[PDB]
Amino acid sequence: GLYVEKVSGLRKDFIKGVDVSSIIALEESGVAFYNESGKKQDIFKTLKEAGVNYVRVRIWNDPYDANGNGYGGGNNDLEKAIQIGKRATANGMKLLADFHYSDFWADPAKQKAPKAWANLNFEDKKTALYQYTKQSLKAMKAAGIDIGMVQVGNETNGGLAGETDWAKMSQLFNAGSQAVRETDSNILVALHFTNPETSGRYAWIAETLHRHHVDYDVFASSYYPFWHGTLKNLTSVLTSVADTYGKKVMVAETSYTYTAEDGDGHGNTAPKNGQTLNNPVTVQGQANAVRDVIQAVSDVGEAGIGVFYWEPAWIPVGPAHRLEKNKALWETYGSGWATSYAAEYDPEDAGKWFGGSAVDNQALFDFKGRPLPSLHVFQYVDTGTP
Ligand SMILES: OC[C@H]1O[C@@H](O[C@@H]2[C@H](O)[C@@H](O)[C@H](O[C@@H]3[C@H](O)[C@@H](O)[C@H](O)O[C@@H]3CO)O[C@@H]2CO)[C@H](O)[C@@H](O)[C@H]1O
Ligand SMILES: OC[C@H]1O[C@@H](O[C@@H]2[C@H](O)[C@@H](O)[C@H](O)O[C@@H]2CO)[C@H](O)[C@@H](O)[C@H]1O
Ligand SMILES: [Ca+2]
Known part of the structure; x- marks a missing residue:
């Protein structure tokens, strides 16, 4: 019964991706996924069949404490990035390596230097970042992974690898870019920012990137309808960057709630009083939301990829209801957003909120691993529902 209005002007090579970085910790936790028919199946195969053509994976330098206890959130390191990349290529999907350049979650409020770079002077940290990127990419190439793009940083609105000065951040951006350029000329270099609704932000950031000669191809943006304003604004701010600086643009992260229920006992991020919810919290609502961001980015024209x-x-x-049993799994496999072992690195946030999944109600699969009708949105935006 799913309905999807065809996206007008959508290019045939439009990038349709998903970030399933938590897939490895989940599978080790006993979680299983299925396909339409209802038979256990590799999620990457189901994704390919759904029209997905790109996979994004977050990479933390060393997401473990001194003894090796994972910080959780998927315990995403280079090793799991290779596992995911291999399965992505094996299923005909390009990879987007997303380097947080930190040992844990990197966002507007958290851009902590990796423990190994904790006390390196700026010069040495820069070359370490360049080196890390270079070696990581090479390990992926060696694994035969088809890399189509690299994100030098994740939501670096106010910092990167412990740095907060934009003159220094730019140098770090270039150190990362450098590594990518040396690895493969065809790999697109992306920079990722968020909060597009903030007046003048993206315009200021793009100009600053330009004034510091940062070498990048894609200006990426997060876009969660709950807090990031209108689609009209998104298209407007991304088009401005595109036309003024000749960069490609895209949405590096987006999602929506298909149900208000919390599936694992650990409070979800959405929905919540105060959040902007323009679509009904249903499978269809979710599908409309995705379809709309795709439309919004496509409306940018040439540059919206x-x-x-x-x-x-x-x-x-x-x-x-098995909350306590779940905690054990989240703790042991880091299949939750964070474990108590991350308190040493991030006492402020992870330290007091560690636990399970905060977005189980925004998946395109139900609580049991069965694909929801909304998964079809990737295929239907091209033609629309029959
Ligand atoms: O569980 C209900 C509560 O969740 C809190 O959110 C927690 C952290 O405060 C939040 O930073 C974290 O977000 C993770 C990561 O830091 C972020 O960059 C990424 O985008 O999402 C991650 C989670 O998917 O999530 C935990 C979850 O407990 C809320 O702050 C609190 O109000 C309440 O909703
Ligand atoms: O990880 C969650 C989420 O954070 C958003 O940014 C929030 C807030 O909305 C901003 O106004 C604030 O400046 O920084 C915090 C981060 O603590 C970000 O915009 C989203 O894309 C997500 O990263
Ligand atoms: Ca939950």
């Missing part, structure tokens, strides 16, 4: 849905399969390791 794609949209990545963030974590469409971070489903529960168990029902909400």
Whole structure:
């Protein structure tokens, strides 16, 4: 019964991606995924069949404490990035390596230097970042992974690898870019920012990137309708960057709630009083939201290259009523957004909120691993529903 209005002007090579970085921790936690028919199947195969043509994976330098206890949130390191990349290429999908350049979650409020770079002077940290990127990419190439793009940083609105001065951040951006350029000329270099609704922000950032000669191809943006303003604004601010600086643009992260229920007992990020919810919290609502961001980015014209849905399969390791049993799994496999072992690195946030999935209700799969009708949105935006 799913309905999808055809996206007008959508290019045939539009990037349709998903970030399923938590897939490895989940599978080790016992979680399983299925396909339409209902038979266990590799999620990457189901994604390919759904029309997805790109996979994004977050990479933390060393997301573990001194003893090796994972910080959680998927315990995403280079090693899991290779596992995911291999399965992505094996299923005909390009890879987007997303380097946070930190040992844990990197966002507007958190851009902590990796423990190894904790006390390196700026010069040495820069070359370490360049080196890390270079070696990581080479390990992926060696694994035969088809890399189509690299994100030098994740939501670096106010910092990167412990740095907050934009003159220094730019040098770090170039150190990362350098590595990518040396690895493969065909790999697109992306920079990722968020909060597009903030007046003049993206215009200021783009101009600053230009004044510091940062070498990049894609100006990426997060876009969560709950807090980031209108689609009209998104298109407007991305088009401005595109036309003024000749860059490509895209949405590196987006999602929507298909249900108000919490599937694993650990409070979800959305929905919540105060959040802007222009679509009904249903499977159709979710599908309309995705379809609309795709339209919004496509409306940018030449420069709008794609949209990545963030974590469409971070489903529960168990029902909400088995909360205590779930905690054990989140703790042991880091299949939750964070573990108590991350308190040493991030006492402020992870330190007091560690637990399970905060987005199980925004997946494109149900709590049991079955694909929701909304997964079809990737195929239907080209033609629309029959
Ligand atoms: O569980 C209900 C509560 O969740 C809190 O959110 C927690 C952290 O405060 C939040 O930073 C974290 O977000 C993770 C990561 O830091 C972020 O960059 C990324 O985009 O999402 C991650 C989670 O998917 O999530 C935890 C979850 O407990 C809310 O702050 C609190 O109000 C309440 O909703
Ligand atoms: O990780 C969650 C989420 O954070 C958003 O940014 C919030 C807030 O909305 C901003 O106004 C604030 O400046 O920074 C915080 C981060 O703590 C960000 O815009 C989203 O894309 C997500 O990263
Ligand atoms: Ca939950």
